[PDB]
Amino acid sequence: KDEQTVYPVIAGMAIGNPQYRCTQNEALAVASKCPGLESIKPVLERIYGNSRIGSRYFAVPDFTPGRAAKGDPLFYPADGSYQVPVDVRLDKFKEKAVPLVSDVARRAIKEAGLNVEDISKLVVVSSTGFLGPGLDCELIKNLGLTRSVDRTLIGFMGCAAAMNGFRNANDYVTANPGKYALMICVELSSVHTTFDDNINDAILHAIFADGCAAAVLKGARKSECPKGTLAIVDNHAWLMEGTEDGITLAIKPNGITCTLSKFLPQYIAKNIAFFADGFLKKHKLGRDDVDFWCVHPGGRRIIEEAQNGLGLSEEQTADSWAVLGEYGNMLSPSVMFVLSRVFKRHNAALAQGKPGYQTGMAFSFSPGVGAEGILLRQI
Amino acid sequence: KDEQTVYPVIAGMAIGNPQYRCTQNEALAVASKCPGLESIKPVLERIYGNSRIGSRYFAVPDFTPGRAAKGDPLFYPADGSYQVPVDVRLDKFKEKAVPLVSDVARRAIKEAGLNVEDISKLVVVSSTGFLGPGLDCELIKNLGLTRSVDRTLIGFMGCAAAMNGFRNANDYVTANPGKYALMICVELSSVHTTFDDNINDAILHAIFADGCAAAVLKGARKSECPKGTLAIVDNHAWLMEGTEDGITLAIKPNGITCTLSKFLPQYIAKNIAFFADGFLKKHKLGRDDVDFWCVHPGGRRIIEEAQNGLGLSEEQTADSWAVLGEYGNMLSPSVMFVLSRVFKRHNAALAQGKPGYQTGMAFSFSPGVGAEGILLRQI
Secondary structure, three states: OOOOOOEEEEEEEEEEOOOEEEEHHHHHHHHHHOOOHHHOHHHHHHHHHOOOOOEEEEOOHHHOHHHOOOOOOOOOOOOOOOOOOHHHHHHHHHHHHHHHHHHHHHHHHHHOOOOHHHEEEEEEEEOOOOOOOOHHHHHHHHHOOOOOOEEEEEEOOHHHHHHHHHHHHHHHHHHOOOOEEEEEEEEEHHHOOOOOOOHHHHHHOOOEOEEEEEEEEEEEOOOOOOOOOEEEEEEEEEEOOOOOOOEEEEEEOOEEEEEEOOOHHHHHHHHHHHHHHHHHHOOOOOHHHOOEEEEOOOOHHHHHHHHHHHOOOOOOOHHHHHHHHHOOEOOOOHHHHHHHHHHHHHHHHHHOOOOOOOEEEEEEEEOOOEEEEEEEEEO | OOOOOOEEEEEEEEEEOOOEEEEHHHHHHHHHHOHHHOOOHHHHHHHHHOOOOOEEEEOOHHHOOOOOOOOOOOOOOOOOOOOOOHHHHHHHHHHHHHHHHHHHHHHHHHHOOOOHHHEEEEEEEEOOOOOOOOHHHHHHHHOOOOOOOEEEEEEOOHHHHHHHHHHHHHHHHHHOOOOEEEEEEEEEHHHOOOOOOOHHHHHHHHHEOEEEEEEEEEEEOOOOOOOOOEEEEEEEEEEOOOOOOOEEEEEEOOEEEEEEOOOHHHHHHHHHHHHHHHHHHOOOOOHHHOOEEEEOOOOHHHHHHHHHHHOOOOOOOHHHHHHHHHHOEOOOOHHHHHHHHHHHHHHHHHOOOOOOOOEEEEEEEEOOOEEEEEEEEEO
16 A cells, blocks of 8 residues: 555646737726826826736727727727626626637646546636626536536635635545546626726726636546646635735626725735745645745735745746736636746756656635635645 | 445534514515506416415515514615615625524534534535625634635525535535535525516515525545434536526626526426436436435425426425425525425434435526436435
8 A cells, every 4th residue: 555645636727818918008098098087197107007017908899999809899888987787797798708718618628638528527716707597507508518517606706716616626526536627717807897986996997807717627646647747735724814804895786896905915914924834834844845836916015915924036926927917917817827837837847857846835815814725746 | 345435424404594584465565565566566466375485584674664673774765666786785695694694504513513613614605695705704703613714605506506515515525534514505585676567576576585504514434424324425417408598697786686487397397307317327226216305495386397397296395395385485595494304304213213214316406407416315
């Protein structure tokens, strides 16, 4: 009995984005051209100018009308009121999510040596889309998944919801070694734009964007995979005390909206060390044993205060900074993106002589405020 | 044979209801007095009388004005228009669910003979509530749960989401045998009332109600449990072709709404055989081998067509009528209420040396329309 322990492994991953790459210069010009926010322009220039978000992707052409696709209508009213009822907004979510989420799912299944029939469990994760028959239903028809597939819709868990999706998958996949589970996170914040008079909303409107990421998971022993394979060995959470006001969500008539506390980055700085050191103590490890960090690119302060809290260099978080610059905050699939660049650099090293990474941690933040995170080591 | 098989078992179960028990004669009187329903007024008396519902529970006093709690206001406007923004409606969900979920969870754990410490995983299920820091965050506060608890919010999966919650808990608990998971279904459809001049909405208003049910889940081996123990041996799903209109759900500005087609009952009777005969053939069993059937009490016609398609007696489905008559359709927990009627008879039979129920099936229906079920067999 040398060992027969089954470890949860990401057998494949895919990254997705809608048509419209909007540079922060164009985003600033649009927001400032909106009437009502005409007396709020000085703060807009400070938020957009000091965002190191180079570009953001949107499903809707309204932010980039000069290069709008032919036959793609502007979603927001002509009078610049940005008044669309919430149900109509969710209709547009579905409208634009289906083509996106089915493509990313397909490429995920393609990354593993798998056919569509092989998926027994489906997890769709969103906080921006809640619809009748779900995207889970839509992915069964467009990809032709066996109609007996297990369905879970993890809704409204904020930017950390990928971690929760991973847990659910690992639990199933560890219970069912030979079986395969698909986990997709998709967000379309370009549907919930209001351009409200307050600075809180102004901050969100400069940060949140569209994106999608899918990952396939399998139950694997240490003799079924290639040499430098990484398995999610452990997971961790901590509901931070006295942080209740950190991330507040709400569904309102004019869209699904958010309020991020001023002291939210401070909450992270004061608590993040306790999370990571507690997580690592389980495995007799320290901060220094970790080769890479997938911090959620929820914005500048998020990454910076994680850096300050954990004492990490700009080089240790370069992948998070990279996803923030090119994509911005895509909400829940944002960490998956960071994991993708990491999984690209790992493998590239494995192609050459190098052993690649031995230990890595990926974490983000949930409404609570909670710290959700996973640890992958080499099997 | 490999006798290290770990089965998921319900270790503790508790049912719960909001404050106000409203009879159907009372509800009919409140419905008929409403001003803006004068196109479907002559229909109302038949809908409420031909519902098989005698009473149902509500969190808001607006349906039983006289019996209002000492310091609990009327939620809906004195206008009699039922115009409340979604955010205010969801704010009320939090206000009333937190206490309800708290004592249901407290009692469930107590009946599992555990302490609040022993819960490792928390799963909240609702299609009538979506909250910033969700109910999961409130339960860790209220019950004083361990702050490292694995939390998941399953949202907008309709009347069958208890099956999805069960699956998610089963997955976790068979992966980690010694550990314990808490699955809670909470629903408050009394916060989404609109009384629209619509035949469909009138029917729904007569049927939908408020309720909560919780279940603690353990992973046990062959003889780690008292003789007579029922365990959830399997789960099965099936999406029905061309039943997309069956159950459609939306979030509109005036609240979360449901809309069911008249053909939903026909979809069930047309497809319920294929689902149930599918489930049982995987385990070499037929309809005869089933002692108890737990059909989702979603309405008069919903139970009837389940009886028709499966050839079930009114005596086998007697639990389903009983829940419906006393509580109405509470959405997710409804299945748990029926289930927690069989368990009383079962446990009382074992107290008197009798063998008890050997094999049963609990199922429900999700937007799709999908069929969602679980199989309970004795160890």
